[PDB]
Amino acid sequence: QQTLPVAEVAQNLPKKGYSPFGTKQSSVAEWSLARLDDLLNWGRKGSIWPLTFGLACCAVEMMHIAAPRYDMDRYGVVFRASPRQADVIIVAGTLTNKMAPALRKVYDQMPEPRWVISMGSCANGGGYYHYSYSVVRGCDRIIPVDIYVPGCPPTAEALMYGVLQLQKKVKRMKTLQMWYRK
Amino acid sequence: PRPLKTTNPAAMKRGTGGRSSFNGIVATVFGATGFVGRYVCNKLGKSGTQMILPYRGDDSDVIRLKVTGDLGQVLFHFYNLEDPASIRDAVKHSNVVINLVGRDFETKNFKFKDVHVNGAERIARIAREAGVERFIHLSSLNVEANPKDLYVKGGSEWLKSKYEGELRVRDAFPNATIIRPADIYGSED
Amino acid sequence: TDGGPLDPKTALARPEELEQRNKLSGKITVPTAVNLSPISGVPEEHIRERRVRIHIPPKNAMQSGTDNVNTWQIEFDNRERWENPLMGWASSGDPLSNMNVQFGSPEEAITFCERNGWRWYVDGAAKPKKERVKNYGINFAWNKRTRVSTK
Amino acid sequence: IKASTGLTGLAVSTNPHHTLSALYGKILRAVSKMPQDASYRKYTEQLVKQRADSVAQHKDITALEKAVGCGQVEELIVQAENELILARKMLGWKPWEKLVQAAPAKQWDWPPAQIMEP
Amino acid sequence: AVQQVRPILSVDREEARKRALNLYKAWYRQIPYIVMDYDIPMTVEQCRDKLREEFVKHRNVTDIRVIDMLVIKGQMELKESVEIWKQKGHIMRYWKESQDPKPTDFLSKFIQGV
Amino acid sequence: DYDGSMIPAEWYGWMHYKTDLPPIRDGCRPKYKWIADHSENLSGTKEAYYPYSTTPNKVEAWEPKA
Amino acid sequence: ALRRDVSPLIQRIRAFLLGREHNLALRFEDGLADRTQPQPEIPDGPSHLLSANYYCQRDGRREVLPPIDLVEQQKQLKLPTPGKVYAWD
Amino acid sequence: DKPTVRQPDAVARSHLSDFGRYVAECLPKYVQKVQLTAGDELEVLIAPEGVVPVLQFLKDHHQAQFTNLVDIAGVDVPCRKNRFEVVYNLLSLRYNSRIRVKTYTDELTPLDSACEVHKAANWYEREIWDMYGVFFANHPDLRRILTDYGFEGHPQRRDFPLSGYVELRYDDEKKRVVCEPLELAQEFRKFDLSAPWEQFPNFRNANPP
Amino acid sequence: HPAAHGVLRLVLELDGETVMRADPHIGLLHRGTEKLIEYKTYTQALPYFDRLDYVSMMCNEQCYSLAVEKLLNIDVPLRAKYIRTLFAEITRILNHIMAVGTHALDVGALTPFFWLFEEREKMMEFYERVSGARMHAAYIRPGGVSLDMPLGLMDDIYEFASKFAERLDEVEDVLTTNRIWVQRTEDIGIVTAEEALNYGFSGVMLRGSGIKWDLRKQQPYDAYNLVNFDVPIGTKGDCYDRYLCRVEEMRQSLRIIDQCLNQMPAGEIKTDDAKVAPPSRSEMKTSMEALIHHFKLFTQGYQVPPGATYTAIEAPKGEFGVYLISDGSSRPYRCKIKAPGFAHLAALEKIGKQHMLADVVAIIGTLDVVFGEIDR
Amino acid sequence: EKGPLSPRFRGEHALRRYPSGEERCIACKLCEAICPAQAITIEAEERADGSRRTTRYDIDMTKCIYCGFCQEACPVDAIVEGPNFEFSTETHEELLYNKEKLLCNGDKWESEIASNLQADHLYR
Amino acid sequence: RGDIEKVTHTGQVFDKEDYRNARFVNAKRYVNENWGIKLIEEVPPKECTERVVFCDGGDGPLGHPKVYINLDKPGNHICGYCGLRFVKK
C-alpha cells in the first residue's frame, strides 16, 4: 500500500492546490472549462441532500449524524423527503424483496446527477441476513452504488467519513472537461 | 476441431449459467454506454461473462452498468479513442471484442473519418496485435460503396464512412464478424 | 336451552345455509395417499429431476459415541459446485443441496416423501449388530491362539 | 357513588347489586340445564352461590368488593356477563362427554425423530 | 386406504369443480383491467392464454382438499391483483421472462454442461 | 485533502481519547522491524486494493507433451 | 477560567430565560474520570474453591426432568386458581 | 446451598398443578393431556376441534379469566403425522399467571379460527397461514402478511430451503426487477454440530410408547 | 413517507382527509430472522435479538438470555443482575427518548428531537465503553454479561444521571403545557380498557388506559426485586396521557439507577459453570479444562436440555416475549418472538378510523412501533 | 476533532503477529465456526517448515456484523477488530479482505492494537 | 507493473496469460513483504539445560497457551504455536 510521504520528503512537496485538475491547462479554452468545471463541483459538493430513507437499524445512526454531536448540516447536508429534490440516497438497512421494487422506483425518480451511499452490512452485501429467503443480497444488485460504508451499524463518524468521500468524489467529476475532448 | 486456447481450469466454463457462472468469455464492449450497449451488456451479464467496459467520458454515465453483472465481473477502463496505449490496456486479456462505437452526427473533435473508419480500424488493428480470438462490428444495412443522396445534399456521409469502416475492419481483422442492423428500436432509441 | 336470546345468525339463517354449514362440519372421507406437490410451491423442475436418499447418517469412525446416528435423514442429490471467479469460494445454484430433515423410521420418511412428490430411494437399514462375546479371560489362554503377547 | 371507574371506557354502574343479581340468577338457570355429573356444573353452581349471596349480603359496593375481592364491582359485572356467554355456548358443545378425538401415536412426543426399539 | 377428514371449503368434487370455474370467471373478467392498470408488455389475448396455460398445470389433481387449497391460493392472488398491491414486477413474474430457455435434448445439455 | 485516515496509529489512541498519554509520554509503544508507515484510505485510485484468491490451484492437469 | 462559557452578563440573561439555574450539559475533562485507569483485579467465583466442588452437585443442566403429567401423577399417587388474585381493576 | 442452580418457585408450582387438574375435569371432551413444564409453566394439549371451546372457557370462566391472548406460535415437525403444531400463550391479569394450549394439525386440515374468543388473533393467524401454510377456517380475511406478494411456498416449514429458490435482480431490458433461479456466490456452509455422547440421561428413557 | 419510518405501508381509504379504512401492509422488513435462528448455535443467535426492537438493544438480549437460562436451569451472580438491571433502565431511557423524539417530529416540533438526541449520544458512550459498540452491544449473555464494567464507568454513569433531570424539564416546558401539543394529541386514538385486553395490548398502551399492570412488579426477573419504583398510569387512554406516561417512566427509571449505582456488590460477572459460559482467557492459556471448554463452547456450543419455555420482560415498547423450543441439540429448534407492536398495529384498523392524516400520523407515533419487531 | 471512543471499540479487522514477526494465526478455525455471519473463510496447509498455517484467510466485510466473537474465540489473539472505523470504499470488491490485506492492517495498526489489548485483556 | 508478477508467500500467482490479471490493470496487488517463514527462521534457537522447557509466546496471558517441549532428541525443537526453536546442549 502506498504509504504517506515522510516529513522531510513532504517538506519539499508543493502546496497541493484546491482544484484536482491543477492549473496546467495548455489553452485558454481548456483552462476556462477546468475552472468552470470546479464551479459546478463546488456547487454540487457543497449541498448534498439525502432522501431520508431510513429502512432499518442503520437508520437510527443515520439520525445521529444529524444530531448536534456531528451535525451533518455543517457540511451543507440537509435531509429532504421528496425524491425529486433529493440528490443523494443513503440506503441504510436490509433491502428485502418486498422493498426492492420500491427502492428502484424511488431511485429512478431521483433526478441526475444522483449518487447512492450504502450504509452498513445489510445494504452492502446482505449483511447478517445474507442467506435469508427474502433478502436482496446487497443493494448494488438493484441500484448502482457510489460509496460503501461498512459497519453494523456504521459509527456516526464512520458515516461522516463516508459522506466526505462522496464530496471528494463529487469534487473530481470531469463533466465539462470531458465534453471538450468529446 | 478448434484448438482450446488455454487449458487453465480457472478459465473454463463453470456453473448453471446464472450470474455466478462463467462463460469463459472475457469481453470488451467499446461503446457500452450507448443505446445498444445497455442491452448487450445486460445480456452478457446474465450468462456470467466477465466484461471490460471502456468509457471515454466521466464515470457517472457508465457507473449504471455495474448493476448488470456480478461482483468482479464488470470493470471500467478510461480510454481515449485516439491513444492506442489506452486501448491496448483494455484488450490485452480479452477473448472477444465488440465495437459499438459510432455516431449519428459529426463533432468538433471527431469527424466520421475519425470514428467510423479510422477509429474502428484502430480498435481492430490493436485487437489483432493482442491476440483476441473473436471480433464483432456493426454497420448499416443499406451500406453501399457510394450511396446517392435522396433529399439532403450531404446526407450520405454517414453511410459512406460506415461502408469504408466495414472494409478496413475486414482488412485488419480478417475473421471479424459483421452484423448489419437496420433501424434499431426499443427504448432510449 | 335457556331463555337468553338466540343467535341472530343461526336463528335467521335460511335452511339451505344451515345445511351447508352442517356438511362443512362434515367429516367426509378422502384417500390417504395424496400428493401435495402443487401447493408446496417447489419449482416444478426440481420435483422432476432430484432424488431423495433416505439414510441413517454415518457414524464418525474417529469417535466411539453413537447418539448422533439415532435418526433417519433425507439428503438431496449432490448437484454441481464451482470455483467462484472473483475470490475462489465454492458456489452453487442448488437450494435444496443445503437441505436436511430428521425422522424416526423409514416408513415415516417414505410417507413424508410421497406426500411431497419427491422421488426417493432408501439405503438399506443397518442390520442390528450380531452379539459379540468379548470375554476377558480368553486373553490368557493355555492352548488357544487368543492369548495376547502384549499387555 | 364512585366519581370515576379509573378505567377508560368503563362507566360507573347504577344499581350494581341488581345487575349482578340478575346475571348470577341467569347463570344458575343456564347451568341447571347441564347434566348433574358435569364437573363444570358442580363448580360454577358452587361458585355462583358464593358470589351471589355476597351481592345480597352487602349493600355497600365498597364493602362488596372487599367481601368478594376480584376487582371493582364494574369488573364483577363484566365477569358475570361472560359466563352467561360461556355457559350458553357450552350447552351446545357438550364438553362433558368423552374425549372427542383420541390422540395419535407420537403426536405429543419430545424430542422428536428418534428410533424407538421394540 | 381411506381416512375421515375435515373438509376445507367443499364437500364434493362437483362443488370443487364449481368453485374452480368461478375462479376462472373472475380472472377472465379481470384481464382487461390488469392490462390497463399495469405498465407491462403483455396484451389481453396473451394473458388470457396464460390463464388457460396454468389452470392446465394442475390437470391431474384429484384430491378435493388439494383442489380447495389451490382455489384458496388462486383466489388470494386475484384479490391482490384486483387490487394493485401486486406491483408491475410481480404480475410479469407469471411469465419468467428473464429466464431464457434451457435446451432439453441430451446433446445440447451435454455440450452446455450440467 | 485532509482525511480522518491520515492520523498515524501512534497518535490515534490519544486523538480518540482512548488514552490520556501521548506517544512521547509513554514507553509501552513497540518498535518492531516489520511495522509499516501509515497510509490513507485509497479508493477510486490507481493505488487501491483488489481482492484475489490466495491459494494456488489444487488439481493438476495431465500434460500430454510430457 | 476552567470552563469555556459565555460572559457573566449573558449567563444571568440565560438563567432568567430558563427560569432555573443551569448546569452545563457539555462534559469537561475535569468532571469525568481519567481515560487511562489502573488495571483491575476481578474477583473469582463462588466455585473456584479447591475442594468439595464436584460438578455433580453444582450442575443444573442434568437436574431438569421431563414434563410432569398432572392427571396421572395423582393416580399413581376454595376452588383452584391459576395463581394469586391481583387488582388490575 | 448451590448458587448456580436456579431455585424453583414452589408456591407458583403448587397453584398451577391443582388448577391444571381443574381444567381436565371441566373439559373432558377436548383436553387430551395436561402437563407442568420444567419451567413451572402449564401446558394443555387439546384436540384440534377443542380450540374455540377451550379458549372460550379459559377467557370467560371466573377461575380462569385468561383474558389476554399473547401469542400464537406455529411449530413444524416433519416426523409427526400431523406435522404442524399451534401454541397459544395466554395471560391472566387478574390471577397473574400464564397457560399454554397446544394443538396439532396436518398440512391440509383447517384449524378453527379463534378471532371470536380473542380477536387479537386476527394477524397472528394470518402469520401462521403465511409462514407455515396452516389454513384457518372462518377467518375474516386470510391473506399473506409477511412474505412478498406472489411468493410461492411457505418459508418456515422445515422442508423449505433456507435461501429459497429464487432471487431478485434488476434487468435493464425489462425496466423492472425480475426473479431468477437462486445462485449464491458462497454456499451456506453447514456445520455438523452433533455431539456423539449423550449428555442429558434423564430424557433417554422418557416418553415410553 | 417520512413518518412511516421507511417500513410501514398504510394503504389508506381516504374520504377526503378522513380515513375510512387503514390496511397496514407489513413485511417490507421481513428478513426471515426466525428461520436463520434455527440454523445457528445459541451463542451465534444472540446478535439476532439486538436487531429485533433495534432501539431497545440490551432489553432484547435480556429476554433471550433469560429464556436460555430457564432451559439451562442456571442462575446469574448477584453483581451481573445489577449490571443487567442498570442497563435495562438505561435502554429504557434511550428508547423513550426515541419515542418522544420521533413522535415530536411527526407532529412537527423539531427542537425536542435535538435536545434529547444530544443526551442520547452521551448515553450510547456507555454502551460503547462496556461493549465496544454504540449499538447492538451483544453484552448480556445467558451466563450474565460478557465483561465487567470498565473501571471508572460508574462515575460517568452518575455524572450523566445527575444532569438528566434538567434536560427533561426543558423539553417538558416546551411540550407538555404547550397549547398546540395538547390539541395534536388529546382525544386522538382512544383505547378503552376492555378493548385493550382483548387485543393483546401491553406496556404503556395498557397503562395508558388505566390498567395497573407492569411486568417488573408482577413477575420480577432481575434486581427489580431489590429496587423500589413507581409505575405511571393514564386515565384517558389517549395519546396525550400516554405521552405523559413515557415521560414519567423516564423519571422513575432515573430513580432506579439511583439505587443500582449504590447497591452494586463486588463479585463474579458470569455464572461459574464453564460448560455454559466461556472461561477466562488467562485460564484458557493455562489449564487444560478451560481450553477444552473454550474449544467446545465456541465450535459446538452448549447443549440445552429438551423443552420449551416462554419468558417475557417489560421492554420499553411493551411485553417482549420469546417462545423458545430446544430439542437437546446445540441449536434451537424454533424461536418464536413476540413483538409488542404486533398487537398494537393490528388495532390501528379501528383506533384511527374516522380520523384524518394528521391524527393518524400522531397515532402511529404513540403506538410506539419499532419495525423489525413486527417483521421477524 | 473527533472521538471519543474506548479501548473496547470494535472496528476493522487485522491479523496480528508475534514480536518475532511470525503470524499468530495457526488456522485453528474457531473464528470461522463462531462467526455468526459466516463471513470468514479459511484454508490451511502444512507449511514448508511444517507449521500449521493458513494459505487462505478471507473476511467478507459486507457480511460481517462486527460482533467481535472472532476476537474472543481466537486462542492466540491472532484476529482482532482494530481501532479503525474509516475504511469506506468506492467499490464492493474492495470490501472483501484477503489475508494480505488483513496482514497489512495488522502492521499499519500494530502499535495501537497492542496498546488496546494490554489495557483491556484483564477484563476479557 | 512489478506487483502483478510478484509471487506471494503462500505461493500463488496468476499466470502471465491468465485473464484474471485483468482485475489489476486499474488497481494494485499488495503482496506482503514480511514473510513469516523467513522472520521466524532468522531468530536463533534458545540453548537450554533442563530436559523440558515451556514456551507461552513470551508474554503470558497475551501469548499463546503454555506448551511444554521435550529436548531429548538432538535436533532443535520447534514450538507448535509461535515457531520458536529450542535446543539442549
Ligand SMILES: NC(=O)C1=CN([C@@H]2O[C@H](COP(=O)(O)OP(=O)(O)OC[C@H]3O[C@@H](n4cnc5c(N)ncnc54)[C@H](OP(=O)(O)O)[C@@H]3O)[C@@H](O)[C@H]2O)C=CC1
Ligand atoms: N438505429 C441504430 O442504432 C443502428 C445501429 N448502428 C450502429 O450501432 C452502433 C451502436 O448503436 P447506438 O447505441 O445506437 O449508438 P449511440 O450513439 O447510442 O452510442 C454510441 C457509443 O459509442 C461511443 N462513441 C461515439 N463516438 C465515440 C468516440 N469518438 N470515441 C469513443 N466513443 C464514442 C459513445 O460513447 P459516449 O456516449 O459516452 O460519448 C457511445 O457509447 C452505432 O455505431 C451505430 O452506427 C448502425 C445502423 C442502425
Ligand code: SF4
Ligand atoms: S447493517 Fe447492522 S445496523 Fe445496519 S440495518 Fe443491518 S443489522 Fe442493523
Ligand code: SF4
Ligand atoms: S466480528 Fe463477528 S461477524 Fe464479524 S468476522 Fe468477527 S465473528 Fe464474524
Ligand code: SF4
Ligand atoms: S481463531 Fe485465531 S488462530 Fe484460529 S483460525 Fe481464527 S485467527 Fe487463526
Ligand SMILES: [Zn+2]
Ligand atoms: Zn510458543
